[PDB]
Design a protein around this nucleic acid. Structure first.
Lengths: 59, 350, 167, 493, 171, 128, 64, 33
RNA sequence: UGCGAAAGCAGUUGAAGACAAGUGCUUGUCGUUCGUUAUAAAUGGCCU
């Protein structure tokens, strides 16, 4: 519905992450989300047709 | 720009080993260059891959072990961890791992039979023996502040002198453990340091369109070969008979008799690949044996494709044309042009 | 000057027994399911399914053995692989000849010919689940009677032995 | 599996006088407007440029009609005596007109107030004033003085060239395309005189004898010239200087003639010819100038014109009558947030590797009778045959299809007099036609063999048979006669 | 690096899916295109594309048979009464699922679907199933390969979403 | 190789030994429905003759349509002649012209002979 | 060819086949293909058999 | 047939005609894999 | 069924055995035989 409306929730604590996403993170109207089976990559599609890729260094 | 981080033909020029990234992990795969085997069995894609289980781990050096020399085909992999992996392509498992005491990444490796020489980022030489699987000796030569490249001169059946390079090039004697000679190198770090023949080794540097041919004994620049664009790979034929250099812009240049105005020579034949629609397909590696030249390019994302051509008969400027998918109407074998089932009978219409 | 030779094929083969229903089709789909084997009255055609074309043809006339056998006898079944023992097929004919042919290649002029021993029995059908083989045969109100034998290959004698099970 | 075949409509063997592709195009000039003018509309011309308004000369005025509006938009009434021409120049900017006094007036088209040039061509009437097609500056005039002066717009005081040699009134002038030097004039002598303006002129290079007073001469092509005079029009070839074709299909004397080519009709080129008998007919130059269509009007036609090839809109056919009537026939020719949310529909995969199309094209909707047959509703399909406003051909097919399917009794079992009369009503009228006579015979035979008892107890069904017996008996007389005329027709041959 | 930087999409990315094993990413949208990218993190070049004329892509997903690993497939669906399957380069082997076997009334669109693994207990065989959303609380379950209608599930009210959970029993 | 099957032509390639087409060349109940019980007594039109011009760009077909039984018109066979055309690249023959009852009513066409190349450059035929 | 769904007694159809169905069988580990034998009873002189292998997914002739 | 040869059809539906090294070892094993 | 043209011209459609039903007798049937050229009807209609 709105831009930058993406949050990552840690489990089993259920506490939303604070450092990311920020005001400067480009997400747009998030319409698709995908986690890689391995390697900890996060792909986020948006209404503009851009698939932006992030890596979780923990994995 | 190129998904293939590193590539290397085998000495015979029939098998190419390339390293690429899958997600965040590097995978090492071997593919067959020839379209068909000697027996005539049609060549097929090899799905097997060696996956590096750690994201940090990376391959810095790739070197083939000559197929004829050893019973088992194997490829030696230098790793940023500070250890060298001996990889057997058939078993698809790392047979043995040579580890240096330190953790610095291996910059370059070279092999002559049982001899195996490597250099770390700390500029410390090491010697290994494949049959013994032992670290023989390690030493540091003064005035070798950086060492990006190592090549062992092919003298007899033993190693008596090593060619090593930085922005400048040097010759070192193993027994004396001291530099024998120095050559004025490039401004940028040296990228290729192959030895064309005796008393003649070529040298090229990153982001440079010039190749310097030096005399090992005398030390004067015999020639300077000039490419249209920057140089990435280099392959020499016979004994200085021909030299093929893969440019950065995706074109392949062939130097015909570069050892015979005289100071600076330009490439004689230029080869390109362009799809039928019009898109240009870059060339990332090549091989040239006697009169046949093998060109390698990437289709899809990382699938390598190969073609064999006889460069002698090719004109000076030659563009290979390849059918790549573009706006293909998709024809299913069980449908005609109009989408009617083939088995179905045509109806009667007045 | 002139000479006469067959060129084209003929009608697809069928299990021409009135009693059998649901077993009329003899054509088989390979284990990898990449090509379909169809016996004709005079040949055996291997069609690649993904491309819808006849990749291979096995003509009885070309072979000496198949020319002698089929040129009356007809194939009663085709079994993928070879029972005696990757692209072998075992053909069972009504009289009892068992012929081991190969597709995807060049036909061998000496196939592993065999002969099941039948006493006034016309082989009607054969089938298997896992290494075990049973053969149904016809013996003689205008109604045909049937017998069910168990078929095994003995390596020592290299022969097919049939043991009576049902009637 | 195969898609179900569509029911094929019955088509009987072709009868004489079928509709031709040429006829179907010319019937589309349907909308007819009849305007009344003060006197005979002597000349009609079309502007060569968009919007292609056409000017009509009548009495002492010239009127320009808007193509789209089909109504007068400009009027040139400065002329004191009768007018005799309104031809535009090739650019369409100027229109010239002749007068009985002999003065030639050049006005700016669409600006009647301004007069650009006034030429006193002769003291006699100036019937023809036509701009040269290739060259814009030179204007041609032919008068009852029998000299066809070639004027120049810049120099209006003396004619550039003064062609002569005509022994009678010259009322026809034509410029040959691709031959700017050549000029063609036809007089009531019956001679068509061709002149070369490059040379000294004043003497025709050669004359073509038409043998009747020539009413209008038109150059259809660079080498072919068609001239209409007397009761026929003849087409001449200049390279051979002989008439290739001649058509005298007209009754009265042909008066006007116009040629249009490279227009969107099935016929590449057309030749319309007025008759003075009320007929204006179309001829095909590609087929030896054979008649392909014709119209009839109240009275004699003096002028005919058709919209130029590049009309760019609704085409027009205009006929001019001596009574003052003008007949015109015309062939007429969400939110941004939502769009950004749904923005992929326009894409056609121009940049993609593989384009895959499986959508089956939409078939036309099937009619009720076809759906019933497809669903094996034999009795209902019969009912749909006899419904109000059902085409006669479409009624024959469902009857033929049911017979072909072998369902004639199957459709007729569960019926009584209430639902049998619609079939008998059609049979009463269908027996007359040759195409449906055979099908009626079969269907009527079955209902009799299947409803004999019901017929006895139903008086309304009986009466349908009495009149039907009368009609079939009448067909017997018609068929018997056709055998007799056939019999005697064999005697002649 | 952005995945779509190499070959941009002309509409919104309606669905994303990583290949279970291979390093591929699949994109889909109302531009009616299925674009596959080789995600490496530095280049992300385009492996291939497939334009489906008049077939908006509301959702797409990879599928790998749990028994026969060699079997790879891509299922895509939109606001249409049919669904597409792409077996896995001269041509593309595309099949269309458009038959519901008597249950067309419950299903007027394939746009919302998911693919799962069903084990046929009485033979111990495993095969894929395609789950669809019906008009009135209806969930229609099809065979992934043959396309047969296997079973249907009904709930009261308007069905909004569903998901699949696996519970192991034994070896 | 063209085989005139009943109411259809089977186009078969003997060099490859595979069928190339099966086309319906007549009207009738041929694939509209599956005949059952008494409908199975119906006889579809029979293609008695099928011939090609010497050029090969025109196909000539002769057909006999059998009326359904137990009607007034149950004994009057209909004889039809048809001329079809196709370009070489195409695979389906397109009917160009249709003659109903050639030679008169209920009179068969026993023989068909396409013309030689000399006359009308092979665009003629005789029916006997 | 009629596929009777025995759970609900429903049925699906594949009509206008080239001939009457002598024989029918499901051919595949997952029923991928259907094998049919067609007769073409129009030709009384000879029995004309045709073997049809259909793709169960969309019921299109995989091999005729 | 418009050539010299003649084709004939049998009732059996048969149309006859009357007319006038380490590398090699590694190559094999890799294909097997 | 034979011949012929499509119209038509000639000529056939028998015997035994078994079974079921009804009451040794009667009828009807035949995934039974020999010989001669030799009404139907289980509510049951075609996808997307």
């Amino acid at each position: 519905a709105v831009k930058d409306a993406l949050r990552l929730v840690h489990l089993p604590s259920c506490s939303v992450f604070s450092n990311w996403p920020t005001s400067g993170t480009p997400l747009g109207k998030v319409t698709s989300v995908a986690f890689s089976p391995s390697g900890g990559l996060l792909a986020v599609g948006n209404e503009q047709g851009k698939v932006r890729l992030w890596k979780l260094n923990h994995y | 720009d190129s998904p293939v981080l590193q590539s290397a033909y085998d000495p015979s020029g029939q098998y190419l080993c390339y390293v690429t990234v899958a997600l965040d992990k590097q995978r090492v795969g071997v593919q067959p260059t020839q379209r068909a085997t000697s027996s005539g069995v049609d060549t097929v894609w090899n799905e097997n891959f060696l996956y590096l289980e750690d994201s940090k781990l990376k391959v810095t050096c790739l070197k083939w072990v000559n197929l004829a020399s050893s019973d088992t085909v194997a490829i030696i992999l230098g790793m940023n961890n500070g250890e060298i992996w001996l990889y057997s392509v058939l078993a698809n498992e790392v047979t043995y791992k040579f580890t240096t005491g330190n953790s610095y990444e291996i910059k370059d490796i070279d092999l002559m039979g049982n001899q195996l020489w490597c250099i770390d980022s700390s500029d410390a030489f090491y010697q290994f023996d494949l049959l013994q699987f032992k670290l023989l000796q390690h030493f540091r030569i003064n005035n070798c502040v950086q060492l990006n490249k190592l090549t062992i001169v092919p003298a007899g059946d033993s190693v008596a002198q090593l060619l090593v390079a930085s922005h400048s090039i040097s010759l070192i004697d193993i027994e004396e453990k001291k530099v024998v000679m120095t050559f004025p190198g490039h401004v940028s770090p040296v990228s290729t340091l192959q030895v064309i023949t005796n008393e003649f080794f070529i040298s090229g540097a990153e982001g440079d369109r010039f190749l310097n041919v030096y005399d090992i004994h005398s030390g004067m620049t015999k020639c300077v070969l000039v490419a249209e664009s920057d140089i990435k790979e280099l392959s020499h034929s016979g004994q200085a008979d021909s030299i093929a250099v893969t440019t950065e812009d995706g074109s392949l240049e062939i130097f015909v008799d570069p050892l015979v105005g005289n100071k600076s020579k330009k490439s004689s034949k230029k080869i390109q690949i362009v799809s039928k629609d019009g898109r240009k397909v870059p060339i990332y590696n090549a091989f040239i044996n006697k009169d046949l030249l093998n060109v390698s390019w990437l289709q899809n994302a990382t699938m390598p494709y190969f073609k064999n051509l006889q460069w002698r008969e090719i004109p000076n400027e030659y563009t290979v044309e390849i059918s790549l998918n573009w706006n293909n109407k998709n024809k299913s074998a069980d449908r005609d042009l109009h989408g009617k089932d083939l088995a179905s009978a045509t109806n009667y219409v007045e | 000057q002139y000479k006469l030779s067959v060129v084209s094929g003929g009608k697809p083969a069928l299990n021409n027994l009135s009693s059998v229903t649901g077993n009329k089709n003899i054509a088989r789909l390979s284990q990898d399911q990449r090509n379909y084997i169809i016996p004709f009255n005079n040949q055996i055609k291997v069609y690649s399914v993904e491309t819808r074309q006849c990749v291979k043809t096995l003509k009885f006339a070309n072979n000496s053995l198949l020319s002698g056998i089929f040129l009356n006898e007809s194939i009663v079944k085709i079994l993928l692989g070879d029972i005696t023992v990757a692209h072998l097929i075992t053909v069972f004919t009504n009289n009892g000849h068992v012929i081991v042919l190969n597709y995807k290649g060049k036909l061998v002029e000496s196939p592993k010919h065999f002969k099941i021993s039948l006493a006034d029995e016309k082989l009607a059908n054969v089938f298997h689940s896992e290494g075990n083989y049973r053969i149904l045969t016809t013996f003689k109100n205008s109604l045909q009677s049937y017998r069910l034998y168990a078929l095994t290959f003995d390596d020592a004698k290299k022969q097919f032995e049939v043991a009576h099970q049902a009637e | 599996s195969t898609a179900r075949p569509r029911i094929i409509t019955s088509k009987a063997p072709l009868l004489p006088q079928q509709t031709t592709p040429e006829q179907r195009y010319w019937r589309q000039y349907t909308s007819a407007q009849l305007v009344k003018e003060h006197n005979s509309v002597t000349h009609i011309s079309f502007n060569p440029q968009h919007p292609h308004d056409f000017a009509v000369t009548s009495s002492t005025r010239v009127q320009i009609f808007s193509s789209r509006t089909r109504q007068v938009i400009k009027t040139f009434s400065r002329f004191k005596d009768v007018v005799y021409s309104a031809s535009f120049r090739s650019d369409g900017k100027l229109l010239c007109a002749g007068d009985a006094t002999g003065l030639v007036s050049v006005y700016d088209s669409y600006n009647p107030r301004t007069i650009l040039l006034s030429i006193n061509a002769s003291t006699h009437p100036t019937h023809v004033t036509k701009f040269h097609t290739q060259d814009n500056k030179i204007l041609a005039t032919a008068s009852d003085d029998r000299v066809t002066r070639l004027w120049d717009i810049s120099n209006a005081y003396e004619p550039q060239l003064e062609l002569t040699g005509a022994t009678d009134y010259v009322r026809t002038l034509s410029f040959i395309p691709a031959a700017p030097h050549l000029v063609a004039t036809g007089s009531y002598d019956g001679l068509i005189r061709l002149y070369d303006t490059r040379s000294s002129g004043s003497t025709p290079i050669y004359s073509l004898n038409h043998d009747q007073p020539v009413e209008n001469v038109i150059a259809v092509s660079p080498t072919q010239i068609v001239s209409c005079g007397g009761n026929n029009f003849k087409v001449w070839d200049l390279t051979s200087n002989k008439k290739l074709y001649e058509r005298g299909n007209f009754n009265k004397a042909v008066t006007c003639l116009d040629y249009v080519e490279n227009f969107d009709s099935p016929m590449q080129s057309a030749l319309i010819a007025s008759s003075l008998d009320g007929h204006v007919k179309v001829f095909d130059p590609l087929d030896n100038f054979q008649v392909k269509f014709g119209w009839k009007f109240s009275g004699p036609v003096l002028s005919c014109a058709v919209s130029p090839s590049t009309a760019q809109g609704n085409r027009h056919l205009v006929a001019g009558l001596s009574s003052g009537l003008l007949a015109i026939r015309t062939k007429k020719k969400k939110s941004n947030n939502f769009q950004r949310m749904m923005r992929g529909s326009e894409y056609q995969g121009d940049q993609e590797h593989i384009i895959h199309n499986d959508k089956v094209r939409s078939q036309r909707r099937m009619r009720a009778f076809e759906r019933n047959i497809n669903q094996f509703k034999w009795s209902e399909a019969l009912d749909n045959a006899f419904v109000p406003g059902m085409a006669k051909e479409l009624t024959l097919t469902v009857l033929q299809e049911l017979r072909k399917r072998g369902k004639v009794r199957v459709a007729l079992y569960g019926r009584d007099e209430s639902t049998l009369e619609p079939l008998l009503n059609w049979c009463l009228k269908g027996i007359e036609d040759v195409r449906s006579a055979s099908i009626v015979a079969d269907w009527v035979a079955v209902v009799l063999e299947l409803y004999g008892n019901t017929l006895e107890s139903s008086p309304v069904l009986q009466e349908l048979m009495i009149d039907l017996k009368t009609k079939v008996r009448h067909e017997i007389h018609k068929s018997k006669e056709a055998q007799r005329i056939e019999g005697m027709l064999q005697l002649l041959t | 690096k952005d995945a779509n930087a190499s070959h941009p999409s002309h509409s919104a990315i309606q669905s994303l899916s990583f290949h279970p094993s291979k390093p591929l990413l699949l994109t889909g949208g109302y531009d009616k295109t299925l674009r596959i990218y080789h995600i490496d993190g530095k280049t992300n070049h385009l492996v291939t594309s497939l334009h489906l004329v008049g077939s908006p892509i509301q959702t797409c997903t990879f599928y790998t048979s749990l028994s026969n690993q060699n079997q790879q497939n891509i299922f895509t669906a939109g606001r249409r009464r049919y669904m597409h399957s792409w077996d896995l380069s001269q041509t593309a082997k595309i099949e269309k699922f458009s038959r519901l076997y008597g249950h067309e009334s419950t299903q007027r669109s394939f746009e919302n679907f998911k693919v799962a693994h069903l084990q046929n207990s009485q033979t111990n065989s495993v095969h894929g199933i395609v789950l669809l959303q019906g008009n009135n609380g209806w969930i229609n379950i099809l065979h992934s390969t043959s396309g047969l209608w296997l079973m249907g599930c009904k709930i009261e009210g308007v069905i909004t979403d569903f998901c699949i959970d696996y519970q192991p029993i034994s070896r | 190789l063209y085989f005139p099957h009943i109411s259809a032509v089977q186009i078969f390639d003997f060099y490859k030994n595979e069928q190339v087409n099966y086309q319906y060349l007549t009207s009738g109940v041929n694939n509209s429905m599956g005949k059952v019980r008494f409908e199975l007594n119906l006889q579809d039109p029979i293609i008695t003759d099928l011939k090609f011009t010497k050029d090969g760009q025109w196909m000539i077909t002769y057909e006999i349509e059998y009326p359904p039984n137990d009607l007034l018109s149950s004994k009057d066979l209909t004889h039809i002649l048809k001329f079809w055309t196709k370009n070489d690249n195409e695979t389906n023959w397109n009917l160009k012209t249709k003659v109903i009852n050639p030679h008169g009513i209920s009179v068969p066409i026993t023989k068909i002979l396409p013309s030689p190349r000399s006359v009308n450059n092979s665009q003629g035929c005789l029916t006997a | 060819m009629s596929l009777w769904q025995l759970e609900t007694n429903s049925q699906q159809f594949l009509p206008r086949l080239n001939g009457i169905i002598i024989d029918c069988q499901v051919l595949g580990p997952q029923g991928n293909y259907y094998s049919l034998i067609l007769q073409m009873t129009e030709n009384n002189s000879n029995s004309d058999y045709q073997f049809l292998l259909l793709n169960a997914s969309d019921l299109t002739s995989k091999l005729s | 047939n418009y050539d010299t040869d003649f084709i004939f059809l049998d009732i059996e539906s048969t149309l006859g005609v009357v007319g006038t090294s380490n590398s090699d070892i590694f190559a094999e094993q890799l294909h097997k894999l």
